[PDB]
């Protein structure tokens, strides 16, 4: 697969559409999310494409190399760690990310896994407490969707 898509839904007002495209040894992530409180919100690939219990059944951040949490620019990060998206005063975040660790094929493939947007900012592992090194202190899961093959 060279293209993928994900539709984010939740039990509140947050919704969004995320697009993925392979380019060289990277994935280009674009799209938008609406219905958010103003400011930064944690954004990650989670391990399982399982929506039987809402966002809870997606499991933890996708982590096939068994590392601690970080930001996307850090060497020590989970494969799924894509940092923060930023919402404007109208509650809209535009997504614009290029990432070298996620993939659409092979061992680090995110096809069939879950994208999640969170309640609070991701502190990129620099919060100075233990939770920072697991989830970035991003808090509850507001919306999610399974990542699918696109035309």
Of positions 104, 116, 142, 143, contacts Cu ion by CB under 5 A: 116
Q: Which is nearer to Zn ion, 15 or 143 (CB)?
A: 143
Q: Is 19 assigned a catalytic role?
A: no
SS3 130: coil
E-strand spans in 1-151? 3-8, 15-23, 26-34, 39-46, 52-55, 81-87, 93-99, 114-118, 141-146, 148-149
Contact between 143 and Cu ion by CB under 5 A: the answer reads no
Binding mask 40-69 for Cu ion (x = CB under 5 A): ----x-------------------------
Contact between 113 and Cu ion by CB under 5 A: the answer reads no
Taking CA atoms, 49 is separated from 9, 34, 73, in Å, by 14, 22, 25
Task: Pick the piece of the chain touching Zn ion (CB under 5 A) from 48-56, 59-67, 85-93, 98-106.
Answer: 59-67
Q: Is 78 assigned a catalytic role?
A: yes
The owner of tokens 């993939």 is 103
Distance of CA 117 to the CA centre of its chain: 6
| Annotated catalytic residue within 40, 118, 122, 123 | 118
Interface with Cu ion by CB under 5 A: which residues? 44, 116
- Positions marked catalytic: 44, 46, 61, 69, 78, 81, 118, 141
């Amino acid at each position: 697969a060279t293209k993928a898509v994900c539709v984010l839904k939740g039990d509140g007002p947050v919704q969004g559409t995320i697009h993925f495209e392979a380019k060289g040894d990277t994935v280009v992530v674009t799209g938008s999310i609406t219905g958010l409180t103003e400011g930064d919100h944690g954004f990650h690939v989670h391990q399982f494409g399982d929506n039987t219990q809402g966002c809870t059944s997606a499991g933890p951040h996708f982590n096939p190399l068994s590392k601690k949490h970080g930001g996307p620019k850090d060497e020590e990060r989970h494969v799924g760690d894509l940092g923060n998206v930023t919402a404007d005063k109208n509650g809209v975040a535009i997504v614009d990310i290029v990432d070298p660790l996620i993939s659409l094929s092979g061992e680090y493939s995110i096809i069939g896994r879950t994208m999640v947007v969170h309640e609070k900012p991701d502190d990129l592992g620099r919060g100075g407490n233990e939770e920072s090194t697991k989830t970035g202190n991003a808090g509850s899961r507001l919306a999610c969707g399974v990542i699918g093959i696109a035309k």
